């Protein structure tokens, strides 16, 4: 009875690099405010 | 400096959680 709407999901290396840069730079920006 | 010591954990998780998400998705992409 297996479900036919399953799809595989992808994240290429470039997207990982972009995503990690976003997170890291968001962290560097907000951290000063979190520590206050 | 008298900073908020929950700021360490908030910064830590702010980085760790979404990055781990990204990594998990990239590595399973590379193995298919």
């Amino acid at each position: 009875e297996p479900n036919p709407n399953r799809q595989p999901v992808e994240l290429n290396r470039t997207s990982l690099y972009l995503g990690l840069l976003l997170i890291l730079v968001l962290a560097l920006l907000f951290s000063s405010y979190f520590f206050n | 400096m008298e900073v908020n010591q929950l700021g360490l954990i908030a910064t830590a998780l702010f980085v760790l959680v979404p990055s781990v998400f990204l990594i998990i998705l990239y590595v399973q992409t590379e193995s298919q």
Partner: peptide, 30 residues
Amino acid sequence: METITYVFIFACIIALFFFAIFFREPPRIT
């Protein structure tokens, strides 16, 4: 702790740079 944290994040980004230049998906001409 806060200095270590700011320095660590900055240092992660420099390491991201290295991998993103030298270990990029090579662009190829399909």
